[PDB]
Structures are given as C-alpha cells and as structure tokens.
Amino acid sequence: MGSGLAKYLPSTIKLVSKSGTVSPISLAGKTVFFYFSASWCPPCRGFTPTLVEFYEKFRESKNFEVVLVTWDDEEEAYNGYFAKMPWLAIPFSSRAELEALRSTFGVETIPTVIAVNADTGAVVSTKGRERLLTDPEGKNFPWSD
C-alpha cells in the first residue's frame, strides 16, 4: 500500500535515513507525520527533542513514521540538525518537492506536523505540534480534529 503517501511525492524520490534510503511505499499501513522544521527556528529546536522522545517510546507501538520537510537552505545546517533525529527526511536537494508539500498542506508556520494515512493519503491531523506538548504518552494520538 503506501500509495496514499506516495501521491504526495514524485515517484522517483527516496527518503533518507541515518544509514541509507527508504522508498515512500515502505511506509505502508503507517500514520506518517510530515514535520516542517528548520535548524534556524528557535521553537523548532525546542520542539524537536519532544518529538524525538515520543518517537523513541512509541514509534512501533503506535505504528508511525516521521518525515522531516526541511526549511533549511544550507546543507551543513540541515546535516547537523537531522543528525539529532531518529526518523526519515526528504533529501536536502529536493527543493521543489519540499515546496510542493508546503503548498499542498498550506503550511504557513513552523514547527508543524501534518499527519497523513500512508495508504489512503487522508489528512489525519494538523495540530500535533501543540497537542503532543500536553499528551507526552500519546493517549490521544494522532491528535485528530
């Protein structure tokens, strides 16, 4: 499946992990959080470790993945910031794909997490950046509505 997630990206993209690459289709069956963030954004820098801790605890139990959608435009800054994260990222050089996601989800501000269902493409939630702060165990994950 994962054909819902794949419709948000070119068919030829691979996501980057810490060690290799990941085909979007491999996220089938998961809730996928597009995390719009930048190393130069102070609230992003403070929110990232909150999301990292949640991912460490619940990635498998809640069956989700995070995909960084960078607003960094300098590759070394991107590299150092993504090094702090355990999840996936759109490659730094995929500038048009990054901008298409901003337009598609109407992302006016960072940090923002947009959750989609990888199989259907449906938007699952848009306020996780705020809701995670008062729900560290994710009892109300994925924070819909």
Add this chain to the structure above:
Amino acid sequence: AMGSGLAKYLPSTIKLVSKSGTVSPISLAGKTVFFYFSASWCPPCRGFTPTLVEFYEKFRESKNFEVVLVTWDDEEEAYNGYFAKMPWLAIPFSSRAELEALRSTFGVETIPTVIAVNADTGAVVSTKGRERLLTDPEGKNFPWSD
C-alpha cells in the same frame, strides 16, 4: 552609489518585477524596504494584502518606502494572479534560491510577515509591521520598530 544595503539581500543580477516592467534593486536606494513574505494559498495573507495595498497607495511616496513580495507560492499562475492585485515589486517567481535565502536570513517562521530594512545600510528596521499596521492605518508609528 546608495542602496548598497540591499546588495546581499537582493543580488544585482536579478531584477525585481513591477506591474509594467523590471526594476534593479539599486533603484530602491534611500528607502525603507518591506520584504513581504506571502502566498496566495494563505488565508491570512489574502486578508492582509489589501490592508497593505491601501497603506502603500496612501503613503509609499510620503513615507519613502517600497514593498518587495517574497513569494511562498510554488505555482506560477497562482503567483501571477496574486501579484496582479499588488501595486509594488516582487522577486521573480523563478528565483527560488533567492526567496529561500531571505527566509533563512530573516528567520521567517510564518506568513504573512513584513520585514523592513534600510536600503542604504541593510539594518533591520522592524519585524512586526504585519500586526502593527492593523491598528495604525495612518502609519503614525511607521515603520513600527521595537
């Protein structure tokens, strides 16, 4: 020559677009320049734009300022239709790296935002005009510095 404060923000090899033609960044010498980060797909942007248009029509001459759209649109027809509503200047749609560099330089986390700079010195003059214009339509406190 004046206007050297803009050289880093608006490289001289890329002219700005106007309603009728093109404009070199150096032509903004001596002015306060508002970088207006905005997108046609952003509802608060669509509502703020006419407020800024009215202020520009009334006061851009008397207060010696210019507005430069920094687009977050990624579709050219959307950019064209939205900039058509505006009387000021814009970074060309295709200048994607220049647009992104301004976002990083001024740390623009949200739109709509206006960042004012001094065209001669490059100094940041104000960052909250998007909010402060709303309650100061005559610009009595322009350029709304902190």
